[PDB]
Design a protein around this ligand. Structure first.
Ligand SMILES: *[C@@H]1O[C@H](CO)[C@@H](O)[C@H](O)[C@H]1NC(C)=O
Lengths: 39, 50
């Protein structure tokens, strides 16, 4: 979900449900995850 | 018996994974306002469609 946020530091108060995007039929066991950046 | 022959072999397999490979499935017409059977992409039943 991509929603507008007021100019604030902390997470806002309220409700915003998250619509689904995709499900993938992979069937691989997962134990760890990371993140990627652009430089 | 000595002329060239082209051969193709097809193999299949199953395991603990989603199928993700299936053949065609055909759709009939759509009727309304009649007590009819229906199979709408996996759910079955009987009733009147409006
Ligand atoms: C993923 O790893 C776990 C822990 O080693 C194992 O129990 C599970 O069978 C694995 N999943 C496979 C092989 O699909």
């Amino acid at each position: 979900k991509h929603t507008p946020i007021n100019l604030e530091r902390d997470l806002p108060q309220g409700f915003s449900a998250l619509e689904p995007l995709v499900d993938l039929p992979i069937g691989i066991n997962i134990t760890r995850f990371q993140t990627l950046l652009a430089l | 018996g000595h002329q060239p022959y082209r051969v193709v072999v097809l193999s299949f397999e199953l395991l603990h994974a989603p199928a993700t490979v299936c053949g065609p499935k055909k759709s009939t017409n759509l009727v309304k306002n009649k007590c009819v059977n229906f199979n709408f992409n996996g759910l079955t039943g009987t009733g009147v469609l409006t």
